[PDB]
A paper describes a structure:
[name] is universally distributed in bacteria, plants and animals. [name] from Escherichia coli (Ec-[name]) is related to the copper-tolerance mechanism. [name] from Homo sapiens (Hs-[name]) appears to be necessary for the localization of acetylcholinesterase at the cell surface. It is known that CutA1s from Pyrococcus horikoshii, Thermus thermophilus and Oryza sativa unfold at temperatures remarkably higher than the growth temperatures of the host organisms.
[name] ([name]–[name]) in a trimeric form was determined at 2.7 Å resolution. This is the first crystal structure of a psychrotrophic [name]. The overall structure of [name]–[name] is similar to those of [name] from Homo sapiens, Escherichia coli, Pyrococcus horikoshii, Thermus thermophilus, Termotoga maritima, Oryza sativa and Rattus norvergicus. The root-mean-square deviations (r.m.s.d.) of the Cα atoms for Ec-[name] and Ph-[name] against [name]–[name] are 1.00 and 1.08 Å as a monomer, and 1.11 and 1.17 Å as a trimer. Another peculiarity is that the β3 strand of [name]–[name] is kinked by Pro residue (Pro58). The intertwined interactions among β strands of [name]–[name] seem to stabilize the trimeric structure as in other [name] proteins. Furthermore, we found that the subunits in the trimer are firmly locked to each other with the highly conserved aromatic residues, such as Tyr45, Trp47, Tyr81, Tyr98 and Trp101, in [name]–[name]. Therefore, we propose that [name] is stabilized by the aromatic cluster in addition to the β strands and hydrophobic interactions. A thermal denaturation experiment revealed that [name]–[name] does not unfold completely at 363 K at pH 7.0, although [name] sp. [name] cannot grow at temperatures exceeding 303 K. These results indicate that the trimeric structural motif of [name] is the critical factor in its unusually high stability and suggest that [name] needs to maintain its high stability in order to function, even in psychrotrophs.
Author numbering:
A (entry chain C), C (entry chain B): 2 to 108
B (entry chain A): 3 to 108
Write the structure that this text describes.
């Protein structure tokens, strides 16, 4: 509403898959940095049943204006269709860090 | 003001977190709850510096369901005033956002 | 957005540093609470190689009003010139928790 930069969260099934997508996304300079956490548990339902995946969390720091491309790359590379993939607004931070994200970006 | 929220919260151990996540998703109040591995919280209680081990939770949900998610989690939580904070979702993969929406009846 | 309170994400090169900065933050009463997670893997470019460091993740919960001092403190204690340090807006939560945050920052 509308922020210059975005914090994206996702998960991969797997930490090798997370790594592949991560590095792709950094080589291409679509994201300045991707963080891959240690395994999380996701509880959801499908669709009358309560489900329990063991997953790998990813945080993507980026420019909003690069969002559609990142979405496309990540989701294309992800084994599921309909992966967790959500964005929250970056609303401030250390200026020179914020500017690095911006400078690194292929705009 | 967003259609959807990312909620951060903390439980004292994995067992209480998992049984709160299950409730919240059985109740169709959250589409998905993520439980992380343990996490060190540092905070001041007696004007003294404390260190609890906790498990972190992320809840993806519709803003409209927030009051119920709040109460559910807070009543079930052992602490009087636990950590519970809302963050805006302002984008994502459409079919994923849609699956969150579809999944609350309201 | 212009929120009362922020969620800040940041990162330290190891847990001892995270602890040291956490402690400072909490004993200065700049942040009511600070969360140090278990290691994460950060992927980013430097000198146009693809790097991955293991890092310790931090969440800071605070009043937007304290922000300038938190940034100042965290950035200067951090060993890198340009640490990861971003804020996202808190737009809601358990009233008495947000209060507690509000009350723990001396006025």
């Amino acid at each position: 509403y509308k922020p210059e930069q975005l914090l994206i969260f996702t998960t991969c099934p797997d930490a090798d898959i997370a790594c592949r997508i991560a590095t792709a996304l950094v080589e291409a300079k679509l994201a300045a940095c991707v963080q891959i956490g240690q395994a999380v548990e996701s509880i959801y339902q499908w669709d009358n049943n309560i489900c329990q995946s063991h997953e790998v969390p990813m945080q993507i720091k980026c420019m909003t204006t690069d969002y559609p491309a990142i979405e496309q790359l990540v989701i294309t590379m992800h084994p599921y269709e309909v992966p967790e993939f959500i964005a929250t607004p970056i609303i401030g931070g250390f200026g020179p860090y914020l500017q690095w994200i911006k400078d690194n970006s292929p705009s």
